[PDB]
Design a binder for these strands. Sequence first.
DNA 1: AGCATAAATAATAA
DNA 2: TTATTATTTATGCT
Lengths: 145, 150
Amino acid sequence: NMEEIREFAKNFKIRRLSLGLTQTQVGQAMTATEGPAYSQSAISRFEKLDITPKSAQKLKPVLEKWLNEAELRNQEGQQNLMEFVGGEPSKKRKRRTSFTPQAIEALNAYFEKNPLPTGQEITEMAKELNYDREVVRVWFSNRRQ
Amino acid sequence: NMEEIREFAKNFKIRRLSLGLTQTQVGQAMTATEGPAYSQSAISRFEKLDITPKSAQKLKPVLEKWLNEAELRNQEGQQNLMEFVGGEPSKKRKRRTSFTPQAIEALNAYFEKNPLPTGQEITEMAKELNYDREVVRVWFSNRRQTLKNT
DNA sequence: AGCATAAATAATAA
DNA sequence: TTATTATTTATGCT
């Protein structure tokens, strides 16, 4: 169901700009309550429609829902938008790779509670540790073996 | 008269956005150009409301006499909207350069060394490096404005 | 199954 | 005004 979608992508960018919003902001609000599928790059790609049809179809409903909720918060006070968004999580910093004792301590705590992580669990762990994903997944791989 | 120009502020930006237009196009096209010129910075400041209300009120008019003038007389055959702007505009985005790792170290080597170089020594680096100056100017620009995070 | 960054644009300085 | 710096997008990556 195609040109349906393209129109949504269209309206979305519009409505977004109308609530005076950056992809980055949405990115943050979204990834919080939804998931990593909702990063700023993702928003850009969606809006530009640089995704596969299977992917758009999936995203659309979840964008629409959220876009509405946001528009509601905007209604009561253009500072309730802010409540709903973030409104300024900001420290986009590079993912560490070199280990620190605090890091290895953390990794081990995770291990006692989860020796055989699924790959999703590995991305989740790495994100919150702010470590390279490969660094984390290999640590776990060896630790078992 | 404040909201009269504070709301034309807010709305002007979004009308310009919702026409896929850069500030730097607005001023660039709407520039007289035999006086008064209109720079991007103007447009920016205007939008963000960084001007004296006294000069705000001055600009506000000539804005509408272009914004409205181009919203209709541009949108009705967009091959013509893009001629409301003119200046042989429509060009395709620059392709995202991918640097050879050989050259990748070359940079941050000379970067760990000299953080904010000069246009003279920059084009020197670029020359011997087989990469075009602007691209190279920006690697530093970027790497400089990125390491604040980490 | 999104990070890292290169380019573009917008803000701010001169 | 111009020149620069900072934010924001877009895109290479299997």
